[PDB]
Write an enzyme that holds these catalytic residues in place. Structure first.
Site, PDB file in Angstrom:
ATOM      1  N   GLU A 204     -10.366 -11.483  -9.750  1.00  9.72           N
ATOM      2  CA  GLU A 204      -9.800 -10.162  -9.688  1.00  9.72           C
ATOM      3  C   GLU A 204     -10.934  -9.159  -9.578  1.00  9.72           C
TER       4      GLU A 204
ATOM      5  N   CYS B 154       1.315  -3.476 -10.444  1.00  6.90           N
ATOM      6  CA  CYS B 154       2.368  -3.430 -11.427  1.00  6.90           C
ATOM      7  C   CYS B 154       1.889  -2.962 -12.786  1.00  6.90           C
TER       8      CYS B 154
ATOM      9  N   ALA C 103      10.041   9.249   1.645  1.00  8.14           N
ATOM     10  CA  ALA C 103      11.465   9.165   1.564  1.00  8.14           C
ATOM     11  C   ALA C 103      11.984   7.833   1.062  1.00  8.14           C
TER      12      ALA C 103
ATOM     13  N   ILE D  86       9.146   5.264  -4.065  1.00  9.03           N
ATOM     14  CA  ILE D  86       8.079   5.899  -4.821  1.00  9.03           C
ATOM     15  C   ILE D  86       8.207   7.369  -4.761  1.00  9.03           C
TER      16      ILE D  86
ATOM     17  N   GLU E 250      11.246   8.465  -7.106  1.00  6.15           N
ATOM     18  CA  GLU E 250      10.896   8.294  -8.493  1.00  6.15           C
ATOM     19  C   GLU E 250       9.834   9.262  -8.940  1.00  6.15           C
TER      20      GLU E 250
ATOM     21  N   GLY F 114       4.591   5.036   2.251  1.00  8.51           N
ATOM     22  CA  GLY F 114       4.542   3.635   2.569  1.00  8.51           C
ATOM     23  C   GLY F 114       3.240   3.092   2.085  1.00  8.51           C
TER      24      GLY F 114
ATOM     25  N   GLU G 181       8.513  -5.843  -1.396  1.00  4.96           N
ATOM     26  CA  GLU G 181       7.500  -5.485  -2.337  1.00  4.96           C
ATOM     27  C   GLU G 181       7.998  -5.207  -3.746  1.00  4.96           C
TER      28      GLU G 181
HETATM   29  C1  FAD Z   1       3.961   3.487  -7.877  1.00  2.00           C
HETATM   30  C2  FAD Z   1       4.517   2.094  -7.727  1.00  2.00           C
HETATM   31  C3  FAD Z   1       5.673   1.755  -8.451  1.00  2.00           C
HETATM   32  C4  FAD Z   1       6.176   0.450  -8.459  1.00  2.00           C
HETATM   33  N1  FAD Z   1       7.196   0.213  -9.317  1.00  2.00           N
HETATM   34  C5  FAD Z   1       7.770  -1.024  -9.335  1.00  2.00           C
HETATM   35  C6  FAD Z   1       8.896  -1.314 -10.236  1.00  2.00           C
HETATM   36  O1  FAD Z   1       9.283  -0.572 -11.140  1.00  2.00           O
HETATM   37  N2  FAD Z   1       9.526  -2.526 -10.077  1.00  2.00           N
HETATM   38  C7  FAD Z   1       9.062  -3.460  -9.151  1.00  2.00           C
HETATM   39  O2  FAD Z   1       9.534  -4.607  -9.167  1.00  2.00           O
HETATM   40  N3  FAD Z   1       8.042  -3.164  -8.324  1.00  2.00           N
HETATM   41  C8  FAD Z   1       7.357  -1.994  -8.418  1.00  2.00           C
HETATM   42  N4  FAD Z   1       6.253  -1.747  -7.601  1.00  2.00           N
HETATM   43  C9  FAD Z   1       5.750  -2.825  -6.741  1.00  2.00           C
HETATM   44  C10 FAD Z   1       4.855  -3.856  -7.438  1.00  2.00           C
HETATM   45  O3  FAD Z   1       3.776  -3.219  -8.120  1.00  2.00           O
HETATM   46  C11 FAD Z   1       4.323  -4.881  -6.436  1.00  2.00           C
HETATM   47  O4  FAD Z   1       5.413  -5.379  -5.665  1.00  2.00           O
HETATM   48  C12 FAD Z   1       3.599  -6.025  -7.055  1.00  2.00           C
HETATM   49  O5  FAD Z   1       2.510  -5.524  -7.802  1.00  2.00           O
HETATM   50  C13 FAD Z   1       3.081  -7.004  -6.001  1.00  2.00           C
HETATM   51  O6  FAD Z   1       2.199  -8.072  -6.625  1.00  2.00           O
HETATM   52  P1  FAD Z   1       0.969  -8.714  -5.795  1.00  2.00           P
HETATM   53  O7  FAD Z   1       0.430  -9.835  -6.545  1.00  2.00           O
HETATM   54  O8  FAD Z   1       1.457  -8.921  -4.424  1.00  2.00           O
HETATM   55  O9  FAD Z   1      -0.077  -7.507  -5.749  1.00  2.00           O
HETATM   56  P2  FAD Z   1      -0.799  -6.554  -6.738  1.00  2.00           P
HETATM   57  O10 FAD Z   1      -0.201  -6.472  -8.097  1.00  2.00           O
HETATM   58  O11 FAD Z   1      -1.038  -5.279  -6.024  1.00  2.00           O
HETATM   59  O12 FAD Z   1      -2.199  -7.256  -7.034  1.00  2.00           O
HETATM   60  C14 FAD Z   1      -3.292  -7.466  -6.028  1.00  2.00           C
HETATM   61  C15 FAD Z   1      -4.548  -7.651  -6.837  1.00  2.00           C
HETATM   62  O13 FAD Z   1      -5.555  -8.312  -6.067  1.00  2.00           O
HETATM   63  C16 FAD Z   1      -6.805  -7.730  -6.371  1.00  2.00           C
HETATM   64  N5  FAD Z   1      -7.692  -7.924  -5.217  1.00  2.00           N
HETATM   65  C17 FAD Z   1      -7.446  -7.606  -3.903  1.00  2.00           C
HETATM   66  N6  FAD Z   1      -8.292  -8.170  -3.083  1.00  2.00           N
HETATM   67  C18 FAD Z   1      -9.189  -8.885  -3.881  1.00  2.00           C
HETATM   68  C19 FAD Z   1     -10.323  -9.671  -3.582  1.00  2.00           C
HETATM   69  N7  FAD Z   1     -10.678  -9.941  -2.326  1.00  2.00           N
HETATM   70  N8  FAD Z   1     -10.983 -10.198  -4.597  1.00  2.00           N
HETATM   71  C20 FAD Z   1     -10.575  -9.928  -5.845  1.00  2.00           C
HETATM   72  N9  FAD Z   1      -9.567  -9.161  -6.265  1.00  2.00           N
HETATM   73  C21 FAD Z   1      -8.854  -8.671  -5.218  1.00  2.00           C
HETATM   74  C22 FAD Z   1      -6.479  -6.295  -6.522  1.00  2.00           C
HETATM   75  O14 FAD Z   1      -7.551  -5.677  -7.256  1.00  2.00           O
HETATM   76  C23 FAD Z   1      -5.130  -6.310  -7.314  1.00  2.00           C
HETATM   77  O15 FAD Z   1      -5.309  -6.400  -8.737  1.00  2.00           O
HETATM   78  C24 FAD Z   1       5.641  -0.518  -7.599  1.00  2.00           C
HETATM   79  C25 FAD Z   1       4.518  -0.178  -6.780  1.00  2.00           C
HETATM   80  C26 FAD Z   1       3.918   1.099  -6.875  1.00  2.00           C
HETATM   81  C27 FAD Z   1       2.631   1.413  -6.153  1.00  2.00           C
HETATM   82  N1  NAP Z   2      11.450   0.263  -8.909  1.00  2.00           N
HETATM   83  C1  NAP Z   2      11.208  -0.414  -7.787  1.00  2.00           C
HETATM   84  O1  NAP Z   2      11.903  -1.361  -7.420  1.00  2.00           O
HETATM   85  C2  NAP Z   2      10.005   0.057  -6.946  1.00  2.00           C
HETATM   86  C3  NAP Z   2       9.587   1.371  -7.069  1.00  2.00           C
HETATM   87  C4  NAP Z   2       8.626   1.869  -6.218  1.00  2.00           C
HETATM   88  C5  NAP Z   2       8.082   1.082  -5.216  1.00  2.00           C
HETATM   89  N2  NAP Z   2       8.493  -0.228  -5.050  1.00  2.00           N
HETATM   90  C6  NAP Z   2       8.150  -0.967  -3.807  1.00  2.00           C
HETATM   91  O2  NAP Z   2       6.957  -0.571  -3.066  1.00  2.00           O
HETATM   92  C7  NAP Z   2       7.315  -0.475  -1.660  1.00  2.00           C
HETATM   93  C8  NAP Z   2       6.522   0.542  -0.842  1.00  2.00           C
HETATM   94  O3  NAP Z   2       6.683   1.836  -1.443  1.00  2.00           O
HETATM   95  P1  NAP Z   2       6.923   3.239  -0.667  1.00  2.00           P
HETATM   96  O4  NAP Z   2       8.106   3.880  -1.303  1.00  2.00           O
HETATM   97  O5  NAP Z   2       5.638   3.979  -0.686  1.00  2.00           O
HETATM   98  O6  NAP Z   2       7.277   2.955   0.880  1.00  2.00           O
HETATM   99  P2  NAP Z   2       8.634   2.922   1.716  1.00  2.00           P
HETATM  100  O7  NAP Z   2       9.700   2.336   0.870  1.00  2.00           O
HETATM  101  O8  NAP Z   2       8.382   2.246   3.014  1.00  2.00           O
HETATM  102  O9  NAP Z   2       9.057   4.443   2.002  1.00  2.00           O
HETATM  103  C9  NAP Z   2       8.256   5.390   2.710  1.00  2.00           C
HETATM  104  C10 NAP Z   2       9.196   6.214   3.571  1.00  2.00           C
HETATM  105  O10 NAP Z   2       8.609   7.494   3.774  1.00  2.00           O
HETATM  106  C11 NAP Z   2       8.884   7.884   5.135  1.00  2.00           C
HETATM  107  N3  NAP Z   2       7.658   8.166   5.921  1.00  2.00           N
HETATM  108  C12 NAP Z   2       6.852   7.324   6.607  1.00  2.00           C
HETATM  109  N4  NAP Z   2       5.851   7.982   7.221  1.00  2.00           N
HETATM  110  C13 NAP Z   2       6.072   9.238   6.869  1.00  2.00           C
HETATM  111  C14 NAP Z   2       5.307  10.348   7.189  1.00  2.00           C
HETATM  112  N5  NAP Z   2       4.318  10.302   8.073  1.00  2.00           N
HETATM  113  N6  NAP Z   2       5.683  11.523   6.674  1.00  2.00           N
HETATM  114  C15 NAP Z   2       6.758  11.630   5.907  1.00  2.00           C
HETATM  115  N7  NAP Z   2       7.526  10.597   5.602  1.00  2.00           N
HETATM  116  C16 NAP Z   2       7.182   9.396   6.063  1.00  2.00           C
HETATM  117  C17 NAP Z   2       9.812   6.878   5.775  1.00  2.00           C
HETATM  118  O11 NAP Z   2      11.210   7.217   5.623  1.00  2.00           O
HETATM  119  P3  NAP Z   2      11.846   8.118   6.783  1.00  2.00           P
HETATM  120  O12 NAP Z   2      11.814   7.291   8.019  1.00  2.00           O
HETATM  121  O13 NAP Z   2      13.223   8.312   6.268  1.00  2.00           O
HETATM  122  O14 NAP Z   2      11.023   9.347   6.838  1.00  2.00           O
HETATM  123  C18 NAP Z   2       9.469   5.652   4.955  1.00  2.00           C
HETATM  124  O15 NAP Z   2      10.621   4.803   4.956  1.00  2.00           O
HETATM  125  C19 NAP Z   2       8.782  -0.102  -1.665  1.00  2.00           C
HETATM  126  O16 NAP Z   2       9.433  -0.432  -0.433  1.00  2.00           O
HETATM  127  C20 NAP Z   2       9.324  -0.907  -2.837  1.00  2.00           C
HETATM  128  O17 NAP Z   2       9.738  -2.227  -2.455  1.00  2.00           O
HETATM  129  C21 NAP Z   2       9.442  -0.735  -5.944  1.00  2.00           C
END
Ligand code: FAD
Ligand code: NAP
Ligand code: FAD
Ligand code: NAP
Lengths: 448, 449
Positions: free
Chosen positions: A32, A40, A173, A176, A179, A260, A307
Site C-alpha cells: 500500500e 473507503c 450529478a 458524490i 451527498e 466522476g 464502484e
Molecule cells: C467520497 C466517496 C464516497 C464513497 N462512499 C461510499 C459509500 O458510502 N458506500 C460504498 O459502498 N462506496 C463508497 N465509495 C466507493 C468506495 O470507496 C470504493 O468503491 C472502494 O474503495 C473501491 O475499493 P478498491 O480496492 O477498488 O480501491 P481503493 O479503496 O480506492 O484502494 C486502492 C488503494 O491502492 C493503493 N495504491 C494504488 N496504486 C498503488 C501502487 N501501485 N502501489 C501501492 N499502493 C497503491 C491506493 O493508495 C489505495 O489505498 C465512495 C467513494 C468516494 C470517493
Molecule cells: N454511498 C454510495 O453507494 C457511494 C457514494 C458515493 C460514491 N460512490 C461510487 O463512486 C462512483 C463514482 O463517483 P461520482 O459520483 O464522482 O461519479 P458519477 O457517478 O459518474 O457521477 C458524475 C456525474 O457528473 C456529471 N458530469 C460529468 N462530467 C461533468 C462535467 N464536466 N461537468 C458537470 N457535470 C459532469 C455526469 O452526469 P450528467 O451527465 O447528468 O451531467 C456524471 O454522471 C459512483 O458511481 C458510485 O458507484 C458510492
C-alpha cells in the site's frame, strides 16, 4: 522475496482478497502506498457517513427541534472538534486492519509498487515476485479540462478542508455530488448544486430523482440545471466565480468538482506485464476477475465495474476462494447489487428501474406499486419531508424485479429486502409477512 | 331495529381494518366506538409513543452526541406544551382520515358503549341494532397492582396526559412499555428509575438483548433497580411519592408509572347473554379463524390474548373479512414468526426463536448461533459509545435461520426485510450471498462469520 500471492493496493478489494487467501495456507503480501483502508476508510465511505451524521444533528437542532418544543442556541460549531473526532475514529480503524492482517501473517509493504514483468514487482528499491498478483489500485477523482479548474477542490480536498466555507458550489450529478451537497447544506453553508441536464441521478428510477429535486427546492442545496461549466475566475478578494456556458455565473468561496472518477492504472508499468486496459484506462477482466495475462487478476474500481466497497470485497473474496480453495466456478454476480445513496433524504435501490423493467419485459408484463407519505419524524413539524417507495413486479406471479425508495429509514431498511429479492420474492411473499408498526419499512409489505 | 351485515364493537386496530375490508366487498357495516377512532394505537400507544421517542432522539442529539461533533448548544427552553400540541394535532389529522375512509366505505360509525342483548343483538345508547356477523375488537386496558397507594401512580394512558415532564420519575415494570417509557423519560432529561422484579427487564427476549439493555442502562440511565417488589406508595406531605419495596429499599419521585401489563376489556359487555366463552384470564377464546364458540361472533386483537401488536390485529381482521365476505374459506393469519421492534434506547428488533427456545426445541447439537458486536457508528466518534449486538440462530446442516435478534441503532428500520426472508425459509447461505450495503448496521447480518 517470493510470495504465493501479492495484492497491490490495501483498499477494499486488496484487503479482502489477501485475508481470504491467507486463510487457505497462502503466503501473502499486501502493498500500500498511502493508508490502509483505501478510498473507503480514508476519503470515502467512513468519513462521509460521520459528516452525514453531523448534518443530521444540526438539522435536529435547527430545523425539527423547534416544533418538538426545543428552543436551542447553537453557540459555536467547532469544525476542529468534529475533524479531530472523525480522525481519531479512522486511526482506530487503521489499527484494527493492521491487527487482522497481522493475525493472518500477511506482510504489509508500505510503498508504491510497479511491474518489472508479469511475475515481478519493484517496491522501494526491492524486488519481490509471486505466482499470482492482484491489481486493486482503485481510482482517483476526475477534473474538468476548463480554464481555472485548479481553483476547485475535489472530494479528497473536501475531507481536508480546514473550515466550513460560507458559500460552496458543487458540480456534478451523481452520488458524490448529491451527498456532499446535502451534507454541506445540512451543516449550514449556502450551497449550490450545478447539474448539466434536468436533475441529478438521472440514471436512477425517475421517482427518486423527481423526489430529490423536490426536497432540494424546499430545503436546499440550491439546484441549478442545464449548467455546463465554462470557466472559474479567481477574484481579487479570493472568491471564485464559476461561469457557465449559457452566461450565468455564481461567486462562491469554495468549488468542489464531483464529476466522476478514473482508474489509477497508469504509473505502474502494465506494458511490461502485458496487461491490457480498455479505452477508458480500466483493466479489462473476465467473469472470474482474470486479466489477459495468466496469473494476474484485477478487482475493484480499477476495472470499471460498479464502484462500491462491498462489490470490491465480495469479488476479492470469491477470487481467493476460486484460486486457493479449489472452487473453479466461484465468482461475483454483478446483478441485483443493492445501493444506498446518503442523500437528504437517503435513497435505497436494488434491481431494475421501472423504465428498465418496461423495456426488458414490456409494459404488459410490468406491475408497479407506489407509496408516498410524510416521514413521521417530520409529520409533526413545519418541514415535512416525503418518503416515496416503489415495487416493480413482472408477470402474473408479480415476481419483484426492483425495490426503490427515498426517505428517512431507506438507509437501514434496504439490506433485508435485497436478500429477499435475491431469493426470488414475489409480491405475495412481501404481503404475507406481518408489518412492524410504526416504521417506514412496513410500507413495502402493505402496498396495495 | 336496524340490521347490518357486519358490526364491529371497537374502532381500534382490528376493528377499523376488518370493517373497512368488509365494506369494500359490499357489506353494509357499523363500527361502534365508545371513545376515539383509532383505539390504543392512534391515541395512547403506537403513534404518540413514537412522537415522544423522536423528541428524545432530538434532545439526545443536542445534549449527548452533539457536543463531540462540535455543536456547543444551549437549550433555552424545552416547551412541553408545544410538543404535546404538535403530537395532538397529528393524532387529530389521523382521526380525520379514518373518518374519511369509513365515510367513503359507507360504514355507519356509532359513538357509544355497546352491550350485547343476545347473540345477534346489541344495545348502544338506548338503540337496539342487529347484524348477521359481529366482531368484538374491544382491546385491553392497563393493569394496576393491588397494593396500598396504587392510586397515586398513573399508568401509560396517564403518561400521555402528563401536563408537564416531572423531575423524578419511577417506572415499575419489565416489559415493552416500561423499557420504552423509561428510556423516553430518561432521554428527555428526567431523573428516571426503572424497577424490575427479577434480574433484568425483557426476560422473555433473547438473553443477549436483556443483557445488552442492562449495559446501556448502567452507562447512561435509566437507573435500574433489580429484585424490586413494590410494597406500597406513600404520598408525602410535600406532594412527592415514596415507592417502598418489599426488601426495604425506597425511592422518592414526583411521578410513578405502573407498566406491569395490560388486561382485556371483555368484562362489561354482557358476553353471558350472547353465550361467548372467555378463558381464565378473561380473553375471548377463538380458533384459527377468529371464531368464538358462537356461530357468527368473531374476535381479533388484544381482547383475544394473541400477541398484542397493532399489525397482528389489522392482519387477522382483514383476513377475517376476506374469509367471510370474499370467498376465501381458509383465509386466516399465521401467528408464527411475527416480527417485533421495541423502541427502547437502542432499538431492539427480533423475530423467530430465541437461542434458548431453539436449543430446547431442536436440541443443542442442531443449533448454530452467529453473533456480532460493534459500536454504533453514530456514537463511535463520541465519548458515549453504544454497542450494537446482533444474533442469527440457525438449525441443521442447511443452517435454516429460525431467529434474527438485534439491539442497536438501525434495528427499528432494518428488521422488516429480514423478516420477509425468514418467512421465505432463508438459510445462512442466502444471507451470505447478498451483497452488503456499506456503511450501514444492517450489513452485519449478511457478512456474519
Ligand atoms: C467520497 C466517496 C464516497 C464513497 N462512499 C461510499 C459509500 O458510502 N458506500 C460504498 O459502498 N462506496 C463508497 N465509495 C466507493 C468506495 O470507496 C470504493 O468503491 C472502494 O474503495 C473501491 O475499493 P478498491 O480496492 O477498488 O480501491 P481503493 O479503496 O480506492 O484502494 C486502492 C488503494 O491502492 C493503493 N495504491 C494504488 N496504486 C498503488 C501502487 N501501485 N502501489 C501501492 N499502493 C497503491 C491506493 O493508495 C489505495 O489505498 C465512495 C467513494 C468516494 C470517493
Ligand atoms: N454511498 C454510495 O453507494 C457511494 C457514494 C458515493 C460514491 N460512490 C461510487 O463512486 C462512483 C463514482 O463517483 P461520482 O459520483 O464522482 O461519479 P458519477 O457517478 O459518474 O457521477 C458524475 C456525474 O457528473 C456529471 N458530469 C460529468 N462530467 C461533468 C462535467 N464536466 N461537468 C458537470 N457535470 C459532469 C455526469 O452526469 P450528467 O451527465 O447528468 O451531467 C456524471 O454522471 C459512483 O458511481 C458510485 O458507484 C458510492
Ligand atoms: C403504550 C403502548 C404502546 C404500544 N406501542 C405499540 C407499537 O409501537 N407497535 C405495535 O404494534 N403495538 C403497540 N402497542 C399495542 C397496540 O396498540 C395494540 O396491540 C393494538 O391497539 C390492539 O388493537 P385492538 O383493535 O385489539 O384494540 P384497541 O386499539 O385497544 O381498540 C379497541 C377499541 O374498542 C373500544 N371499546 C371497548 N369496548 C367497547 C364497547 N363495548 N363499545 C364500544 N367501544 C368499545 C375502545 O374504546 C378502543 O377504541 C402499544 C400499546 C400501548 C398501550
Ligand atoms: N413494540 C411493540 O410493538 C409494542 C410496544 C409496547 C407495547 N406493546 C404491546 O402491549 C403489550 C403489553 O405491554 P406491557 O409492557 O404493559 O406488559 P408485559 O409485556 O406483559 O410486561 C409486563 C412485565 O411487568 C412485570 N410485572 C408484572 N407484575 C408486576 C408487578 N406487580 N410489579 C412489577 N412488575 C411486574 C412482569 O415481568 P417480570 O415477571 O419480569 O417482573 C411482566 O412480564 C406488550 O406485550 C406488547 O405486545 C407492543
Amino acid at each position: 522475496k517470493h510470495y504465493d500471492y501479492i495484492a497491490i493496493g490495501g483498499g477494499s478489494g486488496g484487503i479482502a482478497s489477501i485475508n481470504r487467501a491467507a486463510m487457505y495456507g497462502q503466503k501473502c503480501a499486501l502493498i500500500e502506498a498511502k493508508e490502509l483502508g483505501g478510498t473507503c476508510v480514508n476519503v470515502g465511505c467512513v468519513p462521509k457517513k460521520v459528516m452525514w451524521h453531523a448534518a443530521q444533528i444540526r438539522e435536529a437542532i435547527h430545523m425539527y427541534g423547534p416544533d418538538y418544543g426545543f428552543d436551542t442556541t447553537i453557540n459555536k460549531f467547532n469544525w476542529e472538534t468534529l475533524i479531530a473526532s472523525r480522525t481519531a475514529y479512522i486511526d482506530r480503524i487503521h489499527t484494527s486492519y493492521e491487527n487482522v492482517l497481522g493475525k493472518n501473517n500477511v506482510d504489509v509493504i508500505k510503498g508504491f509498487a510497479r511491474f518489472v514483468d508479469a511475475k515481478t514487482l519493484e517496491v522501494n528499491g526491492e524486488t519481490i515476485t509471486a505466482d499470482h498478483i492482484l491489481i486493486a489500485t482503485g481510482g482517483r477523482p476526475s477534473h474538468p479540462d476548463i480554464p481555472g479548474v485548479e481553483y476547485g477542490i475535489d472530494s479528497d480536498g473536501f475531507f481536508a478542508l480546514p473550515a466550513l466555507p460560507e458559500r460552496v458550489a458543487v458540480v456534478g450529478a451523481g452520488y458524490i455530488a448529491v451527498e456532499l451537497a446535502g451534507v454541506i447544506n445540512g451543516l449550514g453553508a449556502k450551497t449550490h448544486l450545478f447539474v448539466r441536464k434536468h436533475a441529478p441521478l438521472r440514471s436512477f428510477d425517475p421517482m427518486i430523482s423527481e423526489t430529490l429535486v423536490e426536497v432540494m427546492n424546499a430545503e436546499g442545496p440550491q439546484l441549478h440545471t442545464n449548467a455546463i461549466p465554462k470557466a472559474v475566475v479567481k477574484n481579487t478578494d479570493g472568491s471564485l466565480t464559476l461561469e457557465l456556458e449559457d452566461g450565468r455565473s455564481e461567486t462562491v468561496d469554495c468549488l468542489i468538482w464531483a464529476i466522476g472518477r478514473e482508474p489509477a492504472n497508469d504509473n505502474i508499468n502494465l506494458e511490461a506485464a502485458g496487461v491490457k486496459t480498455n479505452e477508458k484506462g480500466y483493466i479489462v477482466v473476465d467473469k472470474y476477475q482474470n486479466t489477459n495475462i495468466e496469473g494476474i487478476y484485477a478487482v475493484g474500481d480499477n476495472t470499471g465495474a460498479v464502484e462500491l466497497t462491498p462489490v470490491a470485497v465480495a469479488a476479492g473474496r470469491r477470487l481467493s476462494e476460486r484460486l486457493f480453495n479449489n472452487k473453479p466456478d466461484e465468482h461475483l454476480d454483478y446483478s441485483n447489487i443493492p445501493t444506498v445513496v446518503f442523500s437528504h433524504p437517503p435513497i435505497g435501490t436494488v434491481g431494475l428501474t421501472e423504465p428498465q423493467a418496461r423495456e426488458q419485459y414490456g409494459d404488459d408484463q410490468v406491475k408497479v406499486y407506489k407509496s408516498s407519505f410524510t416521514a413521521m419524524y417530520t409529520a409533526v413539524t413545519t418541514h415535512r419531508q416525503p418518503c416515496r417507495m416503489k415495487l416493480v413486479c413482472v408477470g402474473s406471479e408479480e415476481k419483484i424485479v426492483g425495490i426503490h425508495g427515498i426517505g428517512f429509514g431507506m438507509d437501514e431498511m434496504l439490506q433485508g429486502f435485497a436478500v429477499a429479492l435475491k431469493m426470488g420474492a414475489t409480491k405475495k411473499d412481501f404481503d404475507n409477512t406481518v408489518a412492524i408498526h410504526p416504521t417506514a419499512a412496513e410500507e413495502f409489505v402493505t402496498m396495495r
